[PDB]
Amino acid sequence: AEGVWSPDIEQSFQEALAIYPPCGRRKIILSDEGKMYGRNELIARYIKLRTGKTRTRKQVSSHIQVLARRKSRD
Amino acid sequence: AEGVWSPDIEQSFQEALAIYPPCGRRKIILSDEGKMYGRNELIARYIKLRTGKTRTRKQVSSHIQVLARRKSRD
Amino acid sequence: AEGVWSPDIEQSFQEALAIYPPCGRRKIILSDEGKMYGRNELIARYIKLRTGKTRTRKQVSSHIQVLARRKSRD
DNA sequence: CACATTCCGCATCGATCT
DNA sequence: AGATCGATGCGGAATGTG
DNA sequence: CACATTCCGCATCGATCT
DNA sequence: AGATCGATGCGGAATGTG
DNA sequence: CACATTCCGCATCGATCT
DNA sequence: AGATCGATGCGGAATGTG
Q1: With contact defined as beta carbons under 8 Å apart, do A61 and A53 qualify?
Q2: What residue of A is the nearest CA neighbor of C31?
Q3: Which residues on chain B are in Cβ contact (under 8 Å) with C37?
Q4: Going along C21-68, which residue ranges are E strands?
Q5: Associated disorder, per UniProt (chains A, B, C)?
């Protein structure tokens, strides 16, 4: 009941969320050359480049799904 | 003569401005699938995801045009 | 031995670094219309839109190459 | 519940084939 | 060499599970 | 003036047509 | 089924307007 | 060393040419 | 008018250089 898992990462995550395609969007353009990334895969790499923590694109696949279940409570 | 319309939104707006294609640019790639957005439409959605306020892509079409008329004063 | 060259710019630069394609990436899509930009060229324009300083895409070509030589020390 | 972990269309992408 | 078709890999939905 | 609101090329995109 | 042509929708310029 | 400055494939892009 | 081929211009590697 304390410091296992972060709330500065939550701000970083939310920065990313906002940066990219806010309430969507662009789908999956890994269609150019020989390494291009997906939406969640970016946000992940953003958080590793803004804290250091490794938080994966499936740790993200999860969280998000979380946050829409919250905006189902009305 | 006080709190009608914001200057934290001005910073958010300017963040967006800088994020996207600084002094331009990329035009209008809503050309992929079945919902992709235009430059100003992004920045708008950025500000709603960073304050909460609804500020539209025409509220932006306006402001900007403002800010180049200022950089006409020399 | 003081204020020649900046460490707030270093944070701005690192913001950009993180924004765009974190540890890469997207190559060089200046392939749309009649003015679209390269990775470093963006980050540069980000820093001029976030401080004011002109720092060029070759001032960047340099720095970076710096920062991987550091992550060669192990 | 806050989580991780199978699913499900997709959409490319390297190898047979008129 | 150009269409054809199994890789493989993503995001997001649907599920485990502690 | 700081604003909102028509314009203007564009550039896709769903429906007739050799 | 593939070119052809009105939708529709954006950003940015040119205008209202309080 | 922290720097700027040639290189090197690339990959578009405006002008000759079946 | 569509392929063909020198522009030109980027990022990143390899070098100057103070």
Answers
A1: no
A2: A32
A3: 21, 25
A4: none
A5: Sveinsson chorioretinal atrophy: Characterized by symmetrical lesions radiating from the optic disk involving the retina and the choroid.
Q: Which domain holds residue B28?
A: 1-74
| Positions of strand D less than 7 angstroms from a protein CB | 2-6, 11-14
- Experimental determination approach used: X-ray
For residues B26 and B12, give the distance between their C-alpha atoms in angstroms, rounded to a whole number. 20
Is the Cβ atom of B67 within 7 Å of strand F at any atom? Answer: no
Quoted resolution (Å):
3.3
Separation in Å: D16 C1' and A65 CA: 42
What is the dihedral angle through the alpha carbons of A32, A33, A35, A36, rounded to the nearest 10 degrees? -10
- Residue C16, classed as helix, strand or coil, is helix
Task: For residue C38, give the 3-state DSSP assignment.
Answer: coil
Question: What's the total number of domains in chain B?
Answer: 1
Closest CA to C23 of A45, A58, A31: A45
- Would you call B25 and C46 a contact, using CB atoms and an 8 Å cutoff? no
Question: Comparing C-alpha atoms, which of C42, C40, C49, C38 is closest to residue C9?
Answer: C49
Cβ within 8 Å, pair C32-B26: yes
